[PDB]
Ligand binder design. Structure first.
Ligand code: SF4
Ligand SMILES: [Zn+2]
Ligand SMILES: [Zn+2]
Ligand SMILES: [Zn+2]
Lengths: 97, 89, 115, 158, 166, 512, 86, 346
């Protein structure tokens, strides 16, 4: 929430993230802004490129290309909001190696 | 050198950022989200996630800094181990 | 209830600004975290009432509107609190449910507002 | 009568059964006369002429039937036969009759003859795909699909 | 049975680092594809060999090891003509229920082709006489995760003669 | 064209294979494309691309062109791809017009794209040898006579000819031969002096090189238009009038181009002599028939002059439009109903009309006609003008006039027919695939008979053909077969409807 | 007030109109038999590109006993560009 | 035995492929169809109406009631989409200018892109250049527009086509029957002379002979977009994999999960704060149902057209509640927060 009157934590302003980038603390920045703010688990079908649930793909009606992915909850909300406008985001996954 | 690497002097203004950069999400977030997003979808644009801004947006580690090199665990391994031969073939 | 011990002695206690349910017998938590609306959002969102949702507040003919406005101005000129106005309009809306009441002359509606 | 009242307008309401019955029975008369002319076989031009029925003739046939309470005029039966024409089962052929039992049309006379439809039901109607209620919703892998389209199920079942 | 060239990335937790990588890979793979049918592939049994074992990456997340491995393991998937010898563990009236010896009771022959005395009248009748063999017809797989099976195959027993048992 | 692409993919996968249909679909979707980008984008090897291109261009389904720097770009002919669906109708009309020798001629031309004199006569003679028995032999004489008759009737036309490379640009060869088409030798049949007999398949240099012959489906479509027109005329007015129309069209078959708004000027005097003697008619009866057909509101024919007694001309575009309107009214009647058909014909006669006018004229009360108008509007058959009293063209302040256009409805109906045929092919292929086990079972039970059919074929195995477990399964097979049969026949029927609409779409389009 | 839909409209709304029976006669049956025989003729002809057989494992002499043979046609290379030669 | 399912794959996103869905792919994606305009049941328990907005098979918003479609907790549930069927096609605000441009880019009868074959080939060649950028694509579209609007007849058809412009409120007008100070076209004479019956039943139609041109409704433009040839799709700068041009015309609406739409039951009162989006969805369902009712009862054609326009305006407000071209007389309600408002702004 907002602050002390609302028992809210502090806010990482843009400048703080700028300093973190300048230091290059990639994993620390990722943990601070994703793990410690809003962490979510999503499933993506490589065939369709669309989000899925519980290792299942409704659009492809299959579960042979699902995968797990950690995400900011705000990012998932943005994806779904963009979906509502029929601007469908198709995620093209790639192996980490 | 950044401001002139494209052969023309490019500003740091919104026009400049539209020029040298391409990311759909950054251009949408800067100003006029609806028009930019709908135009990008209309053109059927595909947008990479290599940039740091979207990396933070996408929740993936950035390439700059500690996210550049890959680590390899020096374990005791034998690549291409000896193979048990098939007799039936 | 406790999933393991089965003890139904679940108590609500306030942690360092965290609402959660914990069993007093085994100290095991059964449900933590709570979702509440923020003021920045409560100020933007609009509250809805049952009548307007079901479609009511639109079946208010010219006569019933005139009657409730008369009730309003009457309780206003008397310098009454808003609770009196609310109770008066509620009683009027309750009395207007009868067929013989709504179908009456102006004198009847005026004396009904008065009563 | 054109704008107020009207033979079809009883209580200012169109009489559907009246027009249906009148159309069906006048079509019966037309097809019977056409069949008699077809079996006449006297001569193709005599065939054409004897197939024809004048507006006054069919009007008198309706009057002798007298099914409708409100007496129908010449133009009323003309409109009934025009509705039949709009169905494609009869055709209109004006001939140059300067005077006669009709005497209404200037220098001409109204001849309506029952004719067969030009083409039987064409393709795409033997298959349920033709303007199917879910044709637009029909899909290769949608909720409704030709693999599970119960329209094929029913039609192939027949 | 048949070997399959199976490619997969295996995650090894750090507390097994003292062991040789290949052995831990084999143990995890055995734990990972045991009694688990693979869609359009067949019923995996156990690992046979490990062919390729490349570099072991470490991720900024879990911190354990991940190794992409090419290997070979055995699966059960008949070629629509194989001769089986199973045991009749149950017999529904619409179709007998044969079970391969300790293998799986999922192969269901619909009784429709033996000698023309075909009827299972629900008192557990093996066959209408004039340790049971099988000619496998087809294979089929499905995704059971339709709600938050899948290998049965049809089985046929024609007039093989069967002089050993009628 | 998405339904067109889907149907073309289905047809090419059915008739030729998979690597060929992939390349064909890619060309249809992409248009003109060089070969290297074709191979790269399709993800296929160079040799497979070569195979697909040769098997396609051999049947004249695709072509190639030369561009800047001598690059060869390949293009697909989607209409030509749809054309193979009408092969059975072409075979039937050839079998009706001429003997089965010409039927086999056109069948082999369709299955081979282009063939020379020697190749086609050899194939036709060989295929005709087995149709007969008792040691009789086919000779190349009758096959050659039938082929030259077919070519002279313009049903068979020469391929575009290979240009003389020695006469023009002798030296560095162009990447493609760049064939050219010559009008005057599309029917110039070369002579085959040699006559022989085809082998009956015991299983125990080229005088006609450079010239290849293909089925001229334009002639087939013109003849089919003739047949449809005469069928409509016979349905409406009289058999004799349709005979007259057929005779005059036959007179104009060679004298008129395939694309002509009107036919040649034909006089009734030569119509009388050209009429078969079977129709016992007189000159005055012919004149009366022709005059009343000119007075027929369908206006198939026209006078266009009084010279030479009764001279007459036919209205190709008008007749095609009338046929298209008749088909449209038939299908809308069958799917919506008789009264909605009445409304459709009423609005066809009255191009601009208001809704209450339609109610009054069709004598359909309220809440019934209007629902039909709304539905038949929503199915894209109908259009509204929205004539405003201001120019804001905005809310309840403008008149709405019903106006139906033939062309748009015909286009969308053609698309619907394409998708319907796609659905039918999908259903037949799915039912064939799901029953391929029983298909192989029946194939094996018939192979037991066919293999070793006379040598050692004991009678004591004839009773063992039904011993295979298909005895109840044949029931299913029969159902599948009839369903398959039904589907195919239905599809073929729908195909004829397409030839109507497309013809209008072709005649209404001039392509300047 | 339109009634609230408690159960969604069916996957198939039943139709009042039925498909017309198909054409009957010798011509139609000849059409059908011709098309079905054409199916097999085009399957057998060398223009029908057979899909490459796969997932066959080991060798045997019996391979030579279940061999399916068919002749291979050739196109006219003077009409075809030289680039497409195998 | 048991179907093997790989729980996770150690992959990372490479790039996001933006693209439109067809209203048909849209219906495929959705789980249930929203048909109940009203939200909750009449009983005091306030049970949400099944197959309607705020159904609990469609995601979840309240902690106690979990997702019914997926057996997961309020936090675990990702959410499920629903679909609403539109009886009449509707424009899309984000794609309104796009459809206008395409209609200026293709003809209305031959429907092909309207440029010379040499111009088409030159534009195709300039498009074959690898790595075309966003700005380059916008410049390409502008160049094609400039070179296309200076002609009148397509190579395929040759039909005359005037300028297409937005007239007022989500309305597209094409002045096909252009008024000329020179000799009039024969087609113009045929069109104007064929108002015989309308003039017969309305004299005032005759003064309205001018200023009465072809207006492209969403249904007719949908039909045109269906028949687009594939060849011209790349020349439209439209990637075929992203979506076909028929997807631009919106005839179905994906209602997003209950995760995006909160339902804050204000315990201090007898009410639930609700998003304006849910109210607009309810209004859309009501509009579709009343359009069905009016079609059944045979209202005026003009009334049906007003219903269609009001549906278009409702969808426009749902997409973006800040538009400067709505029906002044047909006052909707008050200021609301749409999806764009949730996206843009500080
Ligand atoms: S639902 Fe079936 S019959 Fe109807 S259009 Fe689709 S495939 Fe054809
Ligand atoms: Zn998927
Ligand atoms: Zn406990
Ligand atoms: Zn969920």
């Amino acid at each position: 929430t907002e602050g002390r009157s609302r028992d809210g934590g502090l806010r990482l302003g843009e400048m703080e993230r700028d300093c973190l980038i300048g230091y290059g603390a990639s994993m620390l920045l990722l943990e601070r802004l994703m793990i410690s703010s809003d962490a979510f688990e999503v499933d993506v079908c490589g065939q369709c490129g669309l989000l899925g649930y519980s290792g299942w793909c409704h659009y492809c009606k299959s579960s042979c290309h699902v995968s797990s992915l950690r995400i900011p909850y705000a990012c998932k909300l943005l994806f779904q909001e963009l979906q509502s406008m029929n601007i469908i985001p198709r995620l093209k996954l790639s192996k980490y190696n | 050198d950044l401001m002139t690497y494209k052969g023309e002097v490019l500003g740091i203004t919104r026009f400049g950022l539209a020029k040298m950069k391409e990311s759909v999400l950054m251009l949408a977030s800067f100003e006029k989200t609806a028009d930019h997003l709908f135009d990008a979808a209309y053109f059927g644009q595909k947008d990479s996630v290599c940039g740091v801004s979207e990396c933070i947006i996408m929740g993936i580690p950035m390439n700059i800094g500690t996210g550049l090199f890959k680590l390899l665990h020096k374990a005791d391994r034998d690549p291409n181990p000896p193979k048990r031969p098939l007799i039936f073939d | 209830r406790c999933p393991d011990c089965g003890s139904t002695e679940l108590v609500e206690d306030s942690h360092y600004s965290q609402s959660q349910l914990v069993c007093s017998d085994c100290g095991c938590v059964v449900t933590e975290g709570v979702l509440t609306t923020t003021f920045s959002d409560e100020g933007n969102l609009r509250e809805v009432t049952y009548s307007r949702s079901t479609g009511e507040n639109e079946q208010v003919s010219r006569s019933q509107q005139r009657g409730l406005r008369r009730v309003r101005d009457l309780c206003r000129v008397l310098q009454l609190p808003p609770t009196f106005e609310d109770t008066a309009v509620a009683y009027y809306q309750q009395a207007y449910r009868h067929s013989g009441i709504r179908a009456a002359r102006l004198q009847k509606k005026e004396v009904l507002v008065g009563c | 009568r054109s704008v107020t009242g009207g033979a079809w307008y009883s209580d200012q309401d169109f009489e559907s059964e009246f027009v249906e019955v009148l159309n069906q029975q006048c079509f019966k008369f037309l097809q019977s006369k056409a069949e008699t002319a077809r079996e006449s076989k006297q001569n193709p031009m005599i065939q054409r002429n004897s197939s024809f029925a004048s507006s006054h003739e069919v009007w008198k046939y309706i009057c002798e039937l007298g099914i409708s309470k409100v007496e129908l005029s010449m133009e009323d039966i003309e409109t009934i036969l025009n509705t039949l024409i709009y169905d494609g089962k009869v055709e209109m052929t004006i001939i140059a009759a300067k005077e006669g039992t009709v005497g209404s049309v200037d220098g001409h006379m109204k001849l309506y003859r029952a004719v067969n439809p030009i083409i039987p039901p064409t393709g795409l109607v033997r298959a349920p795909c033709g303007l199917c209620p879910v044709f637009d919703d029909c899909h290769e892998g949608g909720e409704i699909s030709p693999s599970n389209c119960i329209y094929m199920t029913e039609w192939l079942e027949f | 049975f048949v070997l399959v060239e199976m490619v997969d990335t295996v995650r090894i937790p750090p507390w097994q680092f003292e062991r040789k990588l290949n052995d831990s890979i084999a143990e995890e793979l055995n734990k990972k594809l045991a009694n688990k049918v693979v869609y359009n592939v067949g019923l995996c049994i156990c690992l046979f060999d490990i062919t390729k074992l490349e570099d072991a990456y470490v991720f900024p997340g879990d911190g354990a090891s991940h190794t992409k491995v090419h290997f070979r393991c055995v699966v059960f998937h008949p070629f629509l003509d194989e001769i089986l010898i199973g045991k009749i563990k149950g017999c529904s009236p619409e179709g007998v229920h044969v079970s391969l010896g300790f293998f799986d009771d999922i192969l269901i022959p619909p009784e429709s082709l033996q000698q023309p005395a075909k009827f299972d009248e629900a008192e557990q009748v093996w066959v209408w006489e004039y340790g049971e063999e099988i000619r496998f017809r087809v294979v089929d797989e499905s995704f059971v995760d339709t709600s938050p099976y899948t290998l049965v195959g049809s089985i046929s027993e024609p007039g093989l003669g069967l002089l050993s048992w009628w | 064209t998405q339904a067109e692409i889907k149907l073309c993919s289905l047809l090419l996968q059915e008739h030729f294979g998979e690597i060929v249909e992939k390349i064909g679909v890619h060309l249809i979707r992409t248009g003109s494309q060089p070969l290297r980008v074709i191979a790269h984008d399709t993800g296929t090897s160079l040799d497979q691309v070569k195979k697909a291109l040769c098997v396609l261009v051999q049947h004249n389904l695709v072509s190639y062109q030369v561009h800047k720097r001598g690059v060869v770009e390949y293009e697909a002919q989607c209409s030509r791809v749809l054309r193979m669906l009408r092969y059975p109708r072409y075979i039937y009309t050839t079998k009706t017009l001429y003997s089965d020798t010409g039927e086999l001629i056109v069948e082999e031309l369709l299955l081979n794209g282009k063939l020379t004199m020697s190749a086609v006569v050899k194939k036709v003679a060989d295929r005709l040898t087995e149709t007969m028995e008792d040691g009789k032999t086919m000779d190349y004489a009758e096959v050659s006579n039938t082929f030259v008759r077919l070519a002279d009737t313009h049903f068979v036309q020469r391929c575009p000819s290979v240009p003389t490379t020695e006469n023009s640009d002798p030296g560095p060869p162009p990447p493609a031969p760049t064939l050219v088409i010559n009008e005057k030798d599309m029917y110039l049949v070369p002579k085959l002096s040699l006559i022989g007999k085809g082998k009956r398949r015991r299983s125990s240099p080229i005088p006609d090189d450079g010239i290849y012959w293909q089925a001229n489906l334009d002639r087939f479509h013109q003849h089919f238009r003739d047949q449809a027109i005469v069928s409509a005329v016979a349905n409406r007015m009289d058999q004799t009038s349709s005979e007259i129309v057929r005779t005059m069209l036959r007179m104009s078959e060679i004298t008129t181009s395939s694309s002509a708004p009107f036919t040649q000027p034909l006089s009734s005097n030569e119509i009388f002599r050209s009429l078969p003697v079977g129709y016992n008619i007189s000159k005055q009866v012919l004149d009366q028939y022709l005059t009343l057909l000119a007075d027929d509101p369908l206006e198939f024919v026209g006078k266009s002059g009084d010279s030479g007694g009764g001279m007459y001309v036919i209205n190709l575009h008008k007749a095609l439009a009338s046929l298209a309107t008749a088909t449209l009214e038939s299908v809308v009647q069958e799917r919506f109903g008789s009264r909605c058909a009445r409304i459709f014909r009423l609005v066809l006669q009255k191009k601009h009309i208001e809704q209450k006018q339609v109610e009054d004229f069709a004598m359909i009360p309220a809440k019934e006609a209007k629902d039909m108008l709304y539905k038949m509007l929503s199915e894209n058959f109908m259009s509204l003008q929205e004539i405003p009293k201001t120019p804001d063209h905005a809310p309840s302040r403008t008149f709405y006039l019903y106006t139906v256009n033939i062309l748009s409805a015909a286009r969308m109906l053609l698309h619907r027919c394409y998708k319907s045929i796609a659905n039918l092919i999908e259903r037949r292929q799915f039912e064939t695939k799901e029953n391929k086990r029983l298909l192989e079972k029946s194939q094996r039970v018939e192979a037991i008979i066919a293999s070793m059919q006379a040598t050692g074929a004991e009678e004591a195995q004839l009773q063992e053909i039904e011993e295979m477990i298909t005895a109840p399964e044949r029931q299913q097979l029969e159902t599948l077969k009839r369903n398959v049969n039904k589907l195919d026949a239905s599809e073929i029927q729908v195909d004829e409807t397409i030839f109507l609409l497309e013809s209008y779409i072709e005649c209404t389009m001039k392509r300047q | 007030l339109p009634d609230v839909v408690l159960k969604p409209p069916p996957l198939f709304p039943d139709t009042d109109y039925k498909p017309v029976p198909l054409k009957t006669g010798e011509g139609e049956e000849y059409m059908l038999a011709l098309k079905q025989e054409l199916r097999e003729t085009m399957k057998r002809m060398p223009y029908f590109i057979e899909t490459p057989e796969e997932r066959q494992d080991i060798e045997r002499y019996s391979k030579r006993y279940m061999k399916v043979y068919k002749e291979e046609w050739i196109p006219d290379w003077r009409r075809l560009p030289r680039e497409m030669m195998p | 035995k048991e179907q093997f399912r790989e729980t996770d794959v150690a992959k990372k996103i490479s790039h996001i492929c933006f693209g439109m869905k067809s209203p048909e792919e849209m219906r495929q994606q959705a789980h249930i169809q929203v048909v109940s305009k009203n939200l909750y049941s009449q009983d005091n328990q306030h049970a949400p109406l099944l197959y309607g907005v705020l159904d609990h098979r469609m995601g979840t918003s309240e902690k106690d009631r979990p997702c019914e479609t997926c057996g997961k907790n309020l936090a675990d549930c990702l959410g499920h989409y629903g679909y609403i069927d539109l009886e009449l096609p509707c424009f899309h605000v984000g794609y309104f200018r796009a459809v206008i441009g395409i209609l200026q880019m293709i003809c209305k009868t031959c429907c092909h892109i309207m440029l010379s074959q040499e111009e088409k080939k030159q534009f195709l060649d300039y498009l074959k250049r690898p790595g075309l950028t966003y700005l380059q694509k916008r410049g390409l579209k502008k160049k094609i527009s400039d070179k296309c609007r200076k002609k009148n007849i397509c190579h395929h058809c040759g039909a005359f086509n005037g300028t297409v412009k937005k007239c007022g409120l989500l309305k597209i007008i094409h002045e096909k029957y252009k008024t000329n100070k020179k000799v009039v076209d024969p087609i113009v004479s045929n069109f104007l002379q064929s108002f015989e019956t309308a003039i017969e039943h309305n004299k005032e139609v005759e003064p309205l002979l001018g200023r009465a041109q072809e207006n492209l409704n969403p249904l007719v433009v949908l039909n045109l977009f269906k028949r687009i040839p594939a060849e011209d799709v790349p020349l439209l700068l439209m990637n075929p994999e992203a979506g076909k041009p028929s997807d631009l015309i919106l005839t179905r609406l994906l209602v997003p999960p209950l995760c995006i739409r909160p339902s804050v039951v204000s315990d201090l009162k007898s009410g639930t704060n609700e998003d304006d989006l849910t109210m607009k969805l309810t209004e859309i369902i009501f509009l579709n149902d009343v359009i069905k009712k009016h079609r059944i009862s045979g209202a005026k054609t003009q009334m049906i057209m007003e219903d269609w326009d009001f549906l278009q305006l409702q969808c426009a407000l749902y997409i973006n509640s800040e538009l400067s071209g709505i029906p002044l007389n047909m006052a909707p309600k008050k200021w609301t927060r749409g999806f764009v408002q949730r996206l843009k702004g500080k």
